[PDB]
């Protein structure tokens, strides 16, 4: 059934100019990562080589090589968010979940994003497609509460 979805995706991006990125985006959105089982057909459709595809996949960060937990937590580690106390937040959260930075699981996945546009609302995060700001050491409780 995966092949069907993939074919659909490829058909949807037919004739476009430089359609590798969109196609990969969609492939990821579908499954959750770029399986090596799907490096070839992409190439076959686009006239590329498995290698080029894998290289593109490897370069960019937003293309998962392996799936994530049921929940995902991106936590800015940039300048501004650092300024208004991101370290402490990070510590509290990774103590709560027991998962350090970059370390994933079947349950959750904590990672970094390096900005979100919430540079005034300095301590910022993205939890499961929901943005959060002004993350003091209290809101983390609510963050974890809705998130086991």
């Amino acid at each position: 059934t995966d092949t069907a979805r993939l074919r659909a995706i490829l058909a949807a991006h037919r004739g476009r100019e430089g359609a590798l990125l969109p196609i990969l985006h969609d492939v990821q959105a579908a499954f959750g990562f770029i399986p090596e089982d799907a490096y070839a057909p992409i190439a076959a459709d686009l006239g590329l080589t498995r290698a080029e595809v894998a290289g593109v996949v490897g370069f960019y960060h937003d293309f998962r090589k392996a799936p994530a937990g049921r929940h995902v937590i991106k936590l800015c580690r940039a300048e501004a968010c650092q300024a208004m106390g991101m370290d402490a937040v990070q510590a509290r959260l990774e103590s709560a979940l027991g998962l350090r930075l970059g370390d994933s699981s079947e349950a959750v996945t904590l990672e970094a994003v390096y900005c979100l546009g919430l540079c005034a609302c300095a301590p910022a995060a993205m939890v499961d497609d929901r943005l959060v700001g002004r993350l003091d050491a209290a809101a983390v409780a609510g963050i974890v509460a809705e998130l086991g």
Binding site: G47, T49, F59
Partner: protein, 949 residues
Amino acid sequence: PPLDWTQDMGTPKREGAPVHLTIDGVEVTVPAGTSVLRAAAEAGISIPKLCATDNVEPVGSCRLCMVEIEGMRGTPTSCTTPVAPGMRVHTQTPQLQKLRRGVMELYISDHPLDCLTCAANGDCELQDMAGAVGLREVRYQAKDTHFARRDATGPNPRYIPKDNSNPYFSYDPAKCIVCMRCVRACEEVQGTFALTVMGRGFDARISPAAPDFLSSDCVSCGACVQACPTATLVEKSVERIGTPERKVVTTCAYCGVGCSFEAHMLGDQLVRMVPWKGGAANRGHSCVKGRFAYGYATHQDRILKPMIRDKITDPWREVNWTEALDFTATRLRALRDSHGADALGVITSSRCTNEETYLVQKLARAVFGTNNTDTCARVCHSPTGYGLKQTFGTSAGTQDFDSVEETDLALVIGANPTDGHPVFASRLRKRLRAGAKLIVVDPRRIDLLNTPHRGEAWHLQLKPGTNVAVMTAMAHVIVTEQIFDKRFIGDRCDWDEWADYAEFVANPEYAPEAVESLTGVPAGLLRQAARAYAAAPNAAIYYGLGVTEHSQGSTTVIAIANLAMMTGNIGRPGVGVNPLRGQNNVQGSCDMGSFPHEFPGYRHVSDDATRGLFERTWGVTLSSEPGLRIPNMLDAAVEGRFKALYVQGEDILQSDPDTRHVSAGLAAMDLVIVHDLFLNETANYAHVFLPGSTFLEKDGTFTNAERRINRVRRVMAPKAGFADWEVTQMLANALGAGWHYTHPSEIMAEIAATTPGFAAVTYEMLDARGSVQWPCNEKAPEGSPIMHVEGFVRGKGRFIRTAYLPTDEKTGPRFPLLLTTGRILSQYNVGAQTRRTENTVWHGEDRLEIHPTDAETRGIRDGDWVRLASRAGETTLRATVTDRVSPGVVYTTFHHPDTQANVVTTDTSDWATNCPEYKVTAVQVAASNGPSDWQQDYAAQAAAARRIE
């Protein structure tokens, strides 16, 4: 001579207006786009470079070619900085020194100090640019590295272990600087994107998307290797053996492209072979076979001493030269007195030089007293030499391989250049990726069609045999419409004939709408392709064995030339009608006789004016009648009146059709000499044996497909003591001729004296110029890169009415499927040279590319054993299901003898040159277990015959 040859400049050569500049206070004049680095190279002032190579386009990765330029800010790169007029550049200041030292510091901070026990010592472009810039200290107490197996706290995750999956080179990333020349080469030069850069930054590692190189799309060709400076990618023969000292230029014994090499030598031990950056044929590129497969010359199975039997059932007897030749000549004279001189014959080898070829045809004409010689070209590209002769005036190519660079379209009939002629396909893909267009007329999806970054492509997947119908329909389209060039016709061709041709072709029976039934190709597609070919400014045709090896080959070639003349794609760089010659020195061979109807120079044998010249030159009476051809030989010997044969460098058994028949004809022969290296399938029916010499031991020339005469040099020493021309003269003098040659230069001199075209040929010329196109007389002294450039040879082209004759090998109930025989990249024709190498990896067993739907009803699965129940025989083979081929078509390979493939193949042949029908054979593929009745007996014979005493 040029500098490009010996020196690795930085960037490629550019064309443009002259531009003056001052590199480090030295005046230079060079084309516009040309870089600072290349100019500085041309001026002698060397600049530090690691990531810049001529093979490819430059990229500012190393940052070590930094220079101070007046009018610029900072320290820009020379690799990327194109010259401009009045530009004044400084190459070595204190600043630049400091920066370069810093960069190398950074490099080496992540490099192991395994120099002095690394393979590429003396040949690493990192080491010598680290000593150049003046590195003396590294200050970074590094913790994060790639080479270190053991970090602190445990193993290094960054450490990637070696990869020796490939039997010819090895990948040790521990020593990788990320210059990316490897990638750039596999993608720009070769054209198969097998390599990429996995990662972002320090974590960036070269990699093929696979566990190992072998599993990948990487075939071989060591471009990746030829370009790696830092022993990361390295040849194993350099790991085992030491790094070489000297270099010697030679050519490959394969493929007819003439890929020139320079053999690197450490004493007398051949360490490796690396392309030369010379020859218009290869500009520093190769394939696997030439680059790596040269180990047949050192195999235990090679034979080094003459042997005589006196009866095929009896075993051999290792014997010296003298008594062997005595026996030989005795039997020969006996037979010559008994059955006549016409009862003898030879078979020249294209694999051999042209000198030896000349000697052999002399031996056959001057000595034996006949015209019964031949060669491999009866079966590869004979019809060509008839059609192009009847139309243009030459039985040879039309253009070089540098022409393709200028074409705007490629029409490929019957060829698979990725396997046949790799280095040409590279240059083709280079042009395809640069916009050019492609039409392919094969029935079998070739990998040229699935090239990366391909432009537009049309594919006429037809039914084999119907190759003239399609051309006729193309012409019908062009004439029905009005797209052809009238100026060209009026000028370079005739008009009286053009009218007739047009009126013939204009018939609606030869229209695409009707042939679609028998052909299998669609109509609209054909019309489109025709319009596209006829519309383009500069189009070029490259054809091979799909046209020739048929019951209508000459006809097809003629049709093709008609198209080429109609459209106007002739007599210009970028266009022509190029046949892709195969074996090395097929062209040379055919040029130096090696045909039973001609003398050296494609001059007929009945020409008294020529026979006189040669009688005078050789001092002997010659025959005016034309000799026999191989099939004729065999039929005769079956019937009688043919008793002798001197087989030079050819396997008449595995590499010829109707194996049963040829065997029965080779057995009924009181004497059949052999002059190969190894014990071939032919020697199973032999009485005598003479060792030959490899291209490494020889000295002479090779005349390739683009008529280029590449020179072959001696690097090793003949293990058997004597090369092949030496042996030939041995035999001839032993018979009673009385030749005295001490060096083949004398022979080439003789040739230049006798035949025209080669009159200006001299070894010194080849040494200086580098290479020559054989039409080199006082006129066109430099050579003739392009034929028919000013009017055709006969004077006026000729239009000929072609028609499609239904082949006799049509299919029926018991032979429903068709068949096709072809090739592979790794292995050569019979693999006597190649099965004795490590190329049995990519291909160790011949397989049958069958179609699924044509298999389901049969019960075939990938890896299953099947039988080819044909008319002319039967064979067992392993299957392979693939949608490559069309339904009702099957594809086999004849490289392996364990499988007897040409036994299936039928006796049917061309009308003119009698080239066989290899590419068509009605067969029945079915499932089976017991191998066969023929293969068993064959193995029995071969085992009971290859035993020595």
